[PDB]
Amino acid sequence: HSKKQDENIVVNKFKPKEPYVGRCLLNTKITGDDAPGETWHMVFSTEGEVPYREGQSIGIVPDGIDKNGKPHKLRLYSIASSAIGDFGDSKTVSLCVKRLVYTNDAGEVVKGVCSNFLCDLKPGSEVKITGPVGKEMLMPKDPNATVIMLGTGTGIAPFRSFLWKMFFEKHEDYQFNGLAWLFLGVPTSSSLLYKEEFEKMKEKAPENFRLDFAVSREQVNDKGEKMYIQTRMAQYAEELWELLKKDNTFVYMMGLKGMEKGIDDIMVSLAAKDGIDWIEYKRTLKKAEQWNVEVY
Numbered sequence: 001h002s003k004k005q006d007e008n009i010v011v012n013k014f015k016p017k018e019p020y021v022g023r024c025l026l027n028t029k030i031t032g033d034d035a036p037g038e039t040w041h042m043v044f045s046t047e048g049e050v051p052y053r054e055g056q057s058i059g060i061v062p063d064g065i066d067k068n069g070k071p072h073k074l075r076l077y078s079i080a081s082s083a084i085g086d087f088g089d090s091k092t093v094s095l096c097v098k099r100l101v102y103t104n105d106a107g108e109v110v111k112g113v114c115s116n117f118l119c120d121l122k123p124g125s126e127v128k129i130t131g132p133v134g135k136e137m138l139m140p141k142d143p144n145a146t147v148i149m150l151g152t153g154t155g156i157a158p159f160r161s162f163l164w165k166m167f168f169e170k171h172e173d174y175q176f177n178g179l180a181w182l183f184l185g186v187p188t189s190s191s192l193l194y195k196e197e198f199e200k201m202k203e204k205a206p207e208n209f210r211l212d213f214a215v216s217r218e219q220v221n222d223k224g225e226k227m228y229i230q231t232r233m234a235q236y237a238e239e240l241w242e243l244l245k246k247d248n249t250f251v252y253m254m255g256l257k258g259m260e261k262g263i264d265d266i267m268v269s270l271a272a273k274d275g276i277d278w279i280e281y282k283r284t285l286k287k288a289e290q291w292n293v294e295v296y
C-alpha cells in the first residue's frame, strides 16, 4: 500500500560484476561556454533491456584501471529521460552529467573519473550500465497530486524524467491534473538546464505547471540578497506552507549536498509563524512519503 508508482518495480536487474553493455548514441554539452563547470546530456541504447521508471538511477562502471590494478566501482546517476525515453521507443536511457573538476589542497587540478569518462564518450562507444536502483524518488500514484520539485544543478534530472511523462507524453492510465511546481537553482544563466523544454511545458499546460528559476549570480530579491533556490521559494512561502498542510502534496529534493541546508533555514521561519517546529514536522512528512530528499 505505497503512495508512489511502484507496481511491478524493477530493481537491480543488472549487477556491477556483470553489467548491461549499451552504446552511446548522442552526447552533447548543454551549458554555455562561460558557465562555472560544463554539463553534458547523453543518450545510451538499452534495446529495452533496462526497464526503469521515472525517478530511478542507473550505475556506470567507467573504463579503466584504478591506482591499484582492479576495475573501478560504479557511480550512480539519476535518469534524465522518462520511462519511454527521449526517442519514445523505450530503447534508450539518458543522463545529465556534470564534469567534475576541482583543484585539491596541494595545488593539483583533479578530474573526477566517472563523470569525465561519460563526458568524453563518443557516439558508438560502449558503456557498462547497472541498475536500475532506487525506490524513494518515484512519482506519486495520484494523477491529481501536487508535486513540488526542488532542484539544484544536475539534480534537475529526475524532474525532467518526471515532467516528460506528465506533459510531453500520452498514457492511457496517467493523465496529470494536479499542480506541478519546479524550482531550479543554478549559478549562471549559462548553467540553466533544459530551460527550453520546461518553457514549452509551461505554455502547453499553464494550469498544471509552474516554473521558477533561481540564478544566484544574476538575480536578487527585495532585500538585495542573492537568489538561491530557498530565496526564490521564500517569495511563495505562505503558499508553499499552505500546500504542505494538504495531505496530497509531495515534495522532491535532488541535487548537490549543500542545498538542503538553506531550504531548512527558511522552512523554520515559515513553520514558526504557525507555531509548529519544522525540524520535527518534517519527520511526519517523511513517514507519510511527502518530504522526499536525495542529495549527493
Ligand SMILES: Cc1cc2nc3c(=O)[nH]c(=O)nc-3n(C[C@H](O)[C@H](O)[C@H](O)COP(=O)(O)OP(=O)(O)OC[C@H]3O[C@@H](n4cnc5c(N)ncnc54)[C@H](O)[C@@H]3O)c2cc1C
Residues within 6 Å of the ligand: 057, 075, 076, 077, 078, 079, 096, 097, 098, 099, 100, 102, 103, 104, 111, 112, 113, 114, 115, 116, 154, 155, 157, 294, 295, 296
Ligand atoms: C543517487 C545519486 C544520484 C546522482 N545523480 C547524478 C547526476 O544526475 N548527475 C551527476 O553529474 N552526478 C550525479 N551523482 C553524483 C555522481 O556520483 C558523481 O558524478 C560522481 O561521484 C563523480 O565522481 P567521479 O567518478 O567523476 O569522480 P571521483 O573519482 O569519484 O571523485 C570523487 C571524490 O573526490 C572528492 N571530491 C568531490 N568533490 C570535491 C571537491 N569539490 N573538492 C575536492 N575534492 C572533492 C570526494 O572525496 C569524492 O569522493 C549522483 C549520485 C547519487 C548517489
